[PDB]
Amino acid sequence: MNPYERGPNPTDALLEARSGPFSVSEENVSRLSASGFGGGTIYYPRENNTYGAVAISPGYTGTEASIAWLGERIASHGFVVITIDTITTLDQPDSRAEQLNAALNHMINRASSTVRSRIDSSRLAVMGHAMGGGGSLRLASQRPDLKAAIPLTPWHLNKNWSSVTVPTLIIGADLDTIAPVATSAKPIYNSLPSSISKAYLELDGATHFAPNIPNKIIGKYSVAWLKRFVDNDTRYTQFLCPGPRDGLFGEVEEYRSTCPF
């Protein structure tokens, strides 16, 4: 009934594991094979199907290494993910939004036949850490044809993103001092239209750099979000709605959404 559904029926354990159910391979993208971004790496399911595609930017001073685990982990759940370097490491969010776009177009039009044939180019999503997350918001603002956006501990000069209609999961870190949620993640989140699918997830005991190491909360709810909105996969709705618990036994500091989806 839903032709975009991929992989087995999800469970907490399956979404929390270090790798998802899809066996993945890599395609190196060097700086000078890449037009409009700094190169990177494509992770793609070996299983010959079509999948949605994700571009992931790092933040200020950061490299591909800072986000690599997340691209691989997400690809292992049924997506073609590019994890990029930026033209320079000090690039600002709007240029990073352009690079996420250049990275999406590389995967669709420029990569090998192996990668291009595995992409449903109509079902695309962007993610970014920090300034990379502001990049995600800007491109989402400019490309309402995108299916999902996941800004991680995001920063942008502008926090008013009421122009975004792309389903957005804002992830914050409670101990973040580089992009405090008081001044960034939360103002950003509340700006997004109450009429779109959106969620706000704040990690507990998390610094700005929590997204830069394997984190099973980030991995779980990123995959759940991309599944629901890139694949329209309603098997994943129950993970987002009502969504993660706070408190002593729960897995998060705070969670808000526009559930039900």
Author numbering: 41 to 301
Reproduce text from the manuscript describing this model.
Cutinase is an esterase that belongs to the α/β-hydrolase superfamily and primarily hydrolyzes cutin from plants. In this work, we investigate the PBAT hydrolysis potency of cutinases and PET-degrading enzymes, and find that cutinases outcompete other reported enzymes.
As a result, the structure of the S170A variant was determined in apo- and MHET-bound forms to 2.21 and 1.82 Å resolutions, respectively.
